[PDB]
């Protein structure tokens, strides 16, 4: 697989950084509970694509591999970047242990595939 | 939204790391000339999804944003990752990636991003 990559957190960060959406939005985004939920929804959406045959299994597997690798390798850095982007214009953080839980959840959901 | 994200370098790297492809393949992947041509071919595939109506302009705009930001901010890291991976595994690579080449790939994407 080679095309499919849902990631709501990443796209929403990009909207704010490109100045397409208000920096005020960083506040709900930088909330670890909402972040955990965003990824859950991503997982549910990707899985629904597989279940309905709309995306082939290999594209959904690629998306899960990318999503897990994003959470493990980039999410902590991105959160801090966006936290710093926001503050440098006028709070909370993301516990490494929540990041693990997101990775765990993606591992779980995927087993279905 | 958005679902589309073509990136051939990222996927091939991931395939070598996962063991789906031989480590023998890292050497070809990490030739900076092949790297530049790979991103050029990706832009063209992406442009053709738009031009064949398989992806809307905002999907391909998302792909080019991620691809441009991948090149400027992740491509050197993944290059080094893969070297470090091929070395441990016993196939040390004697290739490097010019900062200037990174710049020219980003700039090239920046170029085709300006559309159709």
Curated annotation (Swiss-Prot), chain B:
Pfam families: AF0941-like
Record InterPro entries: AF0941-like_sf, Uncharacterised_AF0941
SUPFAM superfamilies listed in its UniProt record: AF0941-like
Protein name: Uncharacterized protein AF_0941
Natural source organism: Archaeoglobus fulgidus (strain ATCC 49558 / DSM 4304 / JCM 9628 / NBRC 100126 / VC-16)
């Amino acid at each position: 697989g080679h095309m499919l990559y849902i990631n709501s957190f990443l796209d929403r960060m990009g909207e704010i950084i490109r100045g397409e959406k208000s920096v005020e939005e960083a506040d709900k985004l930088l909330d670890q509970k909402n972040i955990f939920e965003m990824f859950r929804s991503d997982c549910e959406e990707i899985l629904n694509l597989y279940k309905s045959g709309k995306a082939e299994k290999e594209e959904v597997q690629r998306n899960f591999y990318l999503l897990k690798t994003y959470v493990v390798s980039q999410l902590s850095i991105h959160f801090e970047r966006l936290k710093e982007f926001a503050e440098s214009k006028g709070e909370k953080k993301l516990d490494p242990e929540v990041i693990n839980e997101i990775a765990l959840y993606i591992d779980r959901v995927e087993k279905e595939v």
